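fwd from M.: "can u put these together and see what the complex looks like"

so here's what she sent:
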Amino acid sequence: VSAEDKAAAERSKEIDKCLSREKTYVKRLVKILLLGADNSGKSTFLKQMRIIGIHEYDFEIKNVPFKMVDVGGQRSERKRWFECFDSVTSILFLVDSSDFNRLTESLNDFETIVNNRVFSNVSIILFLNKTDLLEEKVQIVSIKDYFLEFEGDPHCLRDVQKFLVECFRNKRRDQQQKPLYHHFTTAINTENARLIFRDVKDTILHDNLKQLMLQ
Amino acid sequence: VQLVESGGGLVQPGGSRKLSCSASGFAFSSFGMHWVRQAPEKGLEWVAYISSGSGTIYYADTVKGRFTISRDDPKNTLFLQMTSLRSEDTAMYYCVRSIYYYGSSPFDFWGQGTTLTVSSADIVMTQATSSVPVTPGESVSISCRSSKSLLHSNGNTYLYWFLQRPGQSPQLLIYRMSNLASGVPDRFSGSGSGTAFTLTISRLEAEDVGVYYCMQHLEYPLTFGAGTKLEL
Amino acid sequence: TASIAQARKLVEQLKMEANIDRIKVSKAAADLMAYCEAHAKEDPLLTPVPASENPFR
Amino acid sequence: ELDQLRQEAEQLKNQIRDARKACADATLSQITNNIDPVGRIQMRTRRTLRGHLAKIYAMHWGTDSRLLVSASQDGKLIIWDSYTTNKVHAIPLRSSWVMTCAYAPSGNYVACGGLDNICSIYNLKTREGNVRVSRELAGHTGYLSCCRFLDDNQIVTSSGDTTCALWDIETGQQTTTFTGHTGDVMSLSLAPDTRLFVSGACDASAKLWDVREGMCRQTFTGHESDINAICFFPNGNAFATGSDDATCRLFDLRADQELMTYSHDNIICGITSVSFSKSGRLLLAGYDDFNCNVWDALKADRAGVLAGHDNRVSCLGVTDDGMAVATGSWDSFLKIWN
Amino acid sequence: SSFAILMAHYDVEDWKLTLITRVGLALSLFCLLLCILTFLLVRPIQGSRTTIHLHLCICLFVGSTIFLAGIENEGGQVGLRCRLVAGLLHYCFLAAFCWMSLEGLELYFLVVRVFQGQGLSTRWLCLIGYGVPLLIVGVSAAIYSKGYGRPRYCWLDFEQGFLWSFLGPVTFIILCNAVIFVTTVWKLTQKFSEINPDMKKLKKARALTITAIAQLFLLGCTWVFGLFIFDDRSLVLTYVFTILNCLQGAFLYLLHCLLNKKVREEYRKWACLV
């Protein structure tokens, strides 16, 4: 309107188009939060997923974006500010099973994380890592030397596996508004993405159907 | 930054010609471009204007329909094409950069120009005088006149002061009538009353001579004055 | 003797925080309200301005 | 030994308590019991600024009261002209979880910081035509809460590792560090004279700090949970805090005790942001109930409400000339009120 | 002369049908108008589904108003008014059916592909809803423009099979939506226990019976009976068609507006404000 604010308006329109070019990508994004341990082989899992303070990873599966957030051992943060992950759809937990002496430690973290208020509407995906040293240790070292509630024999693998899963599952107060999932992977390094994909799809379908059922 | 132009020469009546400008050292994809002309022994005149985003184009009234202005962002090259030249098109050309957002300083960097030889709503400015003898150590005020108010409703004022030292390209002295451009000694100033404006220089020294120009940018087209020559 | 050093540091901090010039509450409240009333006439949010001079009108 | 030092500390604490109690000759309510209520304040939207794609987390006004910077959790800063809702600049960031921003007084630089534990300083006036980063400041061991400029070469930084730092921008090294809190720190503010500054630290305690020396001069207590906001009164001898107790408090630095409490029975949500006005008469605060409240500071009553947002309000700002108010909330919009 | 003459094929005449048609269309018009108001007013519920609901309600309101106003003719020679009325009714009802098809496609996106990486723009939805009916009317008029209007009614003649110009687009829609409905219900019966764990057999059964009936009156499958109204020896189907389809809008609101929780919250907020 003054021969120079017209140029300013044109500049603003260019910036507006540049911003609006990204909404179609922001609106189709899935976020996962990864938690693990120093001995749990997080790096090997990330490398084998063909990917690439806080680390970010971005990839795509079957034309759907995915973003993964690696917290480099900052779990000591226990205040509400650190719960700015309210947009997350799943928490992926890697836990060791061959080093029995550390197992209890993992549980003490687990019960701390999944019982917070913000994560009551999110799903938990549990991985028991590498799960093949047990096949060579259950016949060597009995699992009764560290735990007392076990009822089965030291040598049958299935009993030990069921016991582990039950101990992990019994840590949730008001267990689940969305279910817990679990799998066994050693060096598969190829099929993990499909399992994550199916579990995320089930959670989103859960939410869609609950939204549709408005009576 | 740096701008280098090319394409001059001598032409016969009829025919066509093409001029090019190449930029180096800055973000050519966020600036706006102007082409300005100069008579062999006289003042300046605006030729054409193109803007970033390729949204607007403005041409001159004396040459509309024979000329075409265009740009190419990835290669940083600007083109002007001309046809059917007459004896009134003997002149020396220059390119000018300008950027418009809140607080910018348009007309900051001028190129080096080139030579080309051929065998009622506009606001008219008048330069007060052609020559003023001065001496080193004194102060000087150089003034020019206008035909309409240059103060728009939003607090602005649109008159520009440039200087042309002997044998060089123009350099910005004052933008928007009261400000000071970068890389300039702090002994210059500008002020004036409605439609009558004046540039003030204190402590006249060497390499402070040339010819001074006052330009307007309120509403296309752009119009120049005759110029004022200084003798030290 | 890390505990002794920590206790000494706490004692030093408290000693520094002890001998500080103090005044009454009434003077502080008086200063606050005086500052408010002094510039009460120039606050555009608390006292509106004519519509003509308002940039956002 | 340890017991004797503890007993001496207890004696000093008793001395401090007695000194604080002896100076309470009156309450703030009794002195100002003859001041006219402000009445009712009905503010309204003047412009709506659109364009962000996520939640706003911080904003800062400029020194000319026309330009502002805003920042969201999608990795972008935007410099807006508030008169014509023009966009002057859009700057992309390198990390997405970023929790503070600031605007340099001279109009040349900006700053940002967050979970990457590094503070970035950006330059605006360039001969090439772009906005490019100039400094990265590193040395903290925890997340970054707030950062404010002091001059064109000195900056102040607060983190959640219980420390604060003063930085020289030209060199890139800390000149002094402030330690003495137990829990992590959330917010800080600077006095008009630019010689002292205050901060609160998630332990129901607040501290005042001296820049030229490096020592803590005094601390105050009284809350029951975290402290989420803090601000300076215009004259530089007062401050106000908000907490997750839904209770706001006003402290003075020369009375060495608490002065005023703002609370209501129908409110059960905490305070996210606090700011003052030009004359110190309006105290403005954003809550988790989806709106903002305008308090009369010297009365501790409700003067007005701003209820235009569809989500939690987390950013509140006031001009240097007193002509506007700016709000930003989780709905991805900024609003200007007058 | 009732509302069952639209899908009639033997010039049915009876007064009971006329009375049913009048009462049903009156209630439908009232409910549909107040539907449009409510969907324009309530904020927290914008999305694709709200848009398609709004457009469907508008089309039904306009078409029902025209039909109730001007179907009956003078019984003699046909003027221009009768032909224009026939064309306008044809366009309006085809528009309603296309909005129903778009509702079905939305449900497909919502239940088949859970990923929210798709979606459509308001412009394309408006183009598809109001564009195909115009093309169909234009082509039909170009081929045979003497078929519009009848000696006793301003509806399509039976010559050359011209009535199929309304039963062509309709049938093809139903046989698609009838698929989607089944799929949706099926999946709910594999999930209800995991969404409401404290419900018995009655609660679950009632929850899977109050939802399916709600979904039936958008996917316009209640019309199927009317496709068989072609004999004077079969009046039970005609009565079913008239009584069920005249109450389309009233059932739409009783299912999708009153029984929604957020709508009740906004209604209570409105009452508190005023």
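replying to her w this: Chain D has one domain: 2-337.
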